[PDB]
């Protein structure tokens, strides 16, 4: 009989629903394939190779394999190991008298512990739950990869557009600063013209560099995640506003969304493992029995080996039970119980963190949308203001400074739009990941 306590799931005090659920889509995030979630064909292609070559995933998938093997050897302790032990012995007197030789060549199993009280059985169950938890950690490593490779690609495309944004503002100032010298001469506060002229163009250059630099940092971080230098045959990609298929993931009930999270099911298996370790410590109060056996030829001389009459066998069953261990037996159980008491608060820590991981992602997608829409219409307005003054200068103006200031306000309000355009895209990848999504590639029946 085994002595492992029944598994009762811990009561994590947490809200039953999220105060930010607005979606109605049937398709769950976990159910949704990432290939049907991420839009950019370039990004879709990148994941397929990274999912095949990523070191962290390769490592995480190997560790789960050795935990399977470590389990398979622990289950083998329930079976007798057969060994062919051939040994010899020899005594003799120092003074120069007599000697004695005994040669035993035989086969036999040494101390098979008959697990009557599920001590080896429970300790083998720990190896299984240890493996089961590692598999879930392998899944968590799978989801963390797709989220990371996506957010690192969004940082690239942002910088791509950040360069081009500062590229054409260097081109639109190019046609104006030469025009500000061929234009009809203005006032003497024209001195307030080359200073912002320089201020616009030389900030635009500093921006292009920062963009071009962060572009490479995203480019290089991508080559690491795919274990390969970036290939050539790739579609030019889509802008940040076209990085996701039109869909917002639902997160129904908190109990529902907990089941999909790998890091959560990894916490219950690591707990079930600690339960098994109790069944091993609780069986220590019980007697342990061990069986020794052997066959073969016993002899005094090598010549007599394997000759008729020398055949012997053995059977030595030895059992034992501790009567007073000075509380050590009680103590080792207490440890096994505390080791398990820590796995329920680790399970609680896992849930409370997992809930927060989602509630933030929901609050972000809501507010990174409202904040983005504001910064976008601001860009449109500042762009419109630029065009109006763009005609004023074309006709009769008292200052290119007006037009020039309008260029910078339109440039700054547009760069601030790209900033929120990325932050919204990044969180979208986190929302998918933290919702358990990214498991399968394609959504199917």
Closest contact distance (angstroms) between CB of 151 and a copy of itself is: 16
How far is 222 from 237, CA to CA, in rounded Å? 15
Give the residue with the Cβ less far from a copy of itself, 245 or 319. Answer: 319
Give the residue with the Cβ less far from a copy of itself, 55 or 164. Answer: 55
Closest contact distance (angstroms) between CB of 175 and a copy of itself is: 20
Closest contact distance (angstroms) between CB of 349 and a copy of itself is: 4
CA distances from 439 to 45, 49, 203, 247 (A): 16, 15, 44, 17
Closest contact distance (angstroms) between CB of 343 and a copy of itself is: 10
Closest contact distance (angstroms) between CB of 67 and a copy of itself is: 10
Token representation of residue 246: 């039109």
**Angle, nearest 10°, between helix axes 119-177 and 400-434?**
170
Give the residue with the Cβ less far from a copy of itself, 13 or 442. Answer: 13
Closest contact distance (angstroms) between CB of 213 and a copy of itself is: 4
Give the residue with the Cβ less far from a copy of itself, 15 or 245. Answer: 15
Burial class (CB in 10 A: 0-12, 13-18, 19+), 195: exposed
- State the number of CA atoms in the 13 A half-sphere of 419 facing the CB: 11
DSSP state of 5: P
DSSP for 371-416?
A: HHHHHHHHHHHHHHHHHHHHHHTTSS-S-HHHHHHHHHHHHHHHHH
CA distances from 302 to 71, 89, 107, 297, 299 (A): 42, 11, 17, 10, 7
CA 344 to chain centre: 22
Give the residue with the Cβ less far from a copy of itself, 135 or 413. Answer: 413
Closest contact distance (angstroms) between CB of 430 and a copy of itself is: 12
How far is 439 from 445, CA to CA, in rounded Å? 15
Report which of 228, 171, 226 is spatially closest to residue 200, judged by C-alpha positions. Answer: 171
Give the residue with the Cβ less far from a copy of itself, 35 or 45. Answer: 45
Give the residue with the Cβ less far from a copy of itself, 25 or 76. Answer: 76
DSSP state of 81: P
- Give the length of the chain: 445
Closest contact distance (angstroms) between CB of 328 and a copy of itself is: 5
**8 Å CB contact between 283 and 117:** yes
**8 Å CB contact between 88 and 279:** no
Give the residue with the Cβ less far from a copy of itself, 4 or 406. Answer: 406
DSSP state of 367: H
Give the residue with the Cβ less far from a copy of itself, 96 or 445. Answer: 96
Give the residue with the Cβ less far from a copy of itself, 245 or 313. Answer: 313
Q: In this structure, what is the dihedral angle of CA atoms 202, 204, 205, 206, given to the nearest 10 degrees?
A: 90
**8 Å CB contact between 329 and 284:** yes
Closest contact distance (angstroms) between CB of 325 and a copy of itself is: 6
Closest contact distance (angstroms) between CB of 247 and a copy of itself is: 21
How far is 389 from 302, CA to CA, in rounded Å? 112
């Amino acid at each position: 009989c085994t002595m492992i306590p029944q598994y009762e799931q811990p009561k994590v005090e947490v809200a039953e629903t999220f105060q930010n659920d607005t979606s109605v889509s049937s398709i769950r995030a976990v159910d949704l394939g990432w290939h049907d979630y991420f839009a950019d064909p370039r990004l879709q292609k990148l994941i397929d190779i990274a999912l095949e070559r990523n070191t962290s995933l390769r490592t995480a998938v190997l560790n789960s394999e050795i935990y399977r093997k470590q389990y398979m050897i622990e289950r083998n302790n329930l079976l007798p190991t057969l060994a062919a032990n051939a040994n010899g012995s020899r005594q003799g007197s120092l003074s120069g008298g007599n000697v004695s030789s005994s040669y035993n060549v035989g086969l036999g199993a040494a101390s098979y512990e008959l697990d009557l009280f599920g001590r080896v059985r429970s300790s083998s169950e720990a190896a299984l739950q240890g493996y089961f938890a590692s598999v879930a950690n392998r899944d968590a490593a799978h989801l963390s990869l797709i989220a990371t490779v996506a957010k690192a690609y969004f940082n690239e495309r942002y910088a791509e557009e950040a360069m081009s944004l500062a590229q054409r503002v260097l081109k639109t100032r190019e046609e104006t600063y030469n025009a500000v010298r061929i234009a009809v001469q203005g006032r003497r506060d024209f001195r307030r013209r080359p200073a912002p002229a320089e201020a616009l163009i030389e900030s635009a250059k500093a921006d292009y560099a920062h963009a071009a630099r962060s572009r490479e940092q995203a480019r290089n971080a991508l080559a690491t995640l795919i274990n390969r230098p970036i290939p050539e045959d790739l579609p030019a990609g889509l802008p940040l506003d076209k990085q996701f298929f039109v869909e917002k993931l639902p997160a129904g009930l908190s109990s529902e969304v907990l089941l999909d999270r790998p890091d959560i099911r990894a916490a219950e298996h690591a707990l079930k493992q600690a339960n098994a370790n109790i069944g091993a410590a609780r069986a220590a109060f019980f007697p342990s029995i061990r069986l020794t056996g052997s066959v073969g030829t016993g002899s005094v001389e090598l010549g007599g080996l394997f000759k008729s009459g020398t055949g012997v066998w053995a059977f030595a069953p030895s059992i034992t039970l501790p009567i007073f261990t000075w509380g050590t037996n009680k103590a080792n159980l207490d440890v096994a119980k505390l080791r398990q008491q820590a796995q329920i608060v680790a399970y609680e820590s896992a849930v409370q963190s997992a809930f927060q991981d989602v509630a933030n992602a929901l609050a972000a997608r809501e507010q990174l949308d409202k904040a983005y829409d504001a910064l976008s219409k601001q860009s449109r307005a500042s762009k419109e203001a630029l065009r109006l003054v763009g005609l004023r200068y074309k006709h009769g103006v008292s200052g290119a400074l007006d037009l020039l200031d309008a260029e910078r306000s339109s440039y700054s309000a547009e760069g601030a739009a790209l900033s929120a355009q990325l932050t919204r895209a990044e969180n979208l990848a986190d929302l998918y990941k933290a919702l358990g999504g990214g498991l399968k590639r394609d959504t199917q029946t």
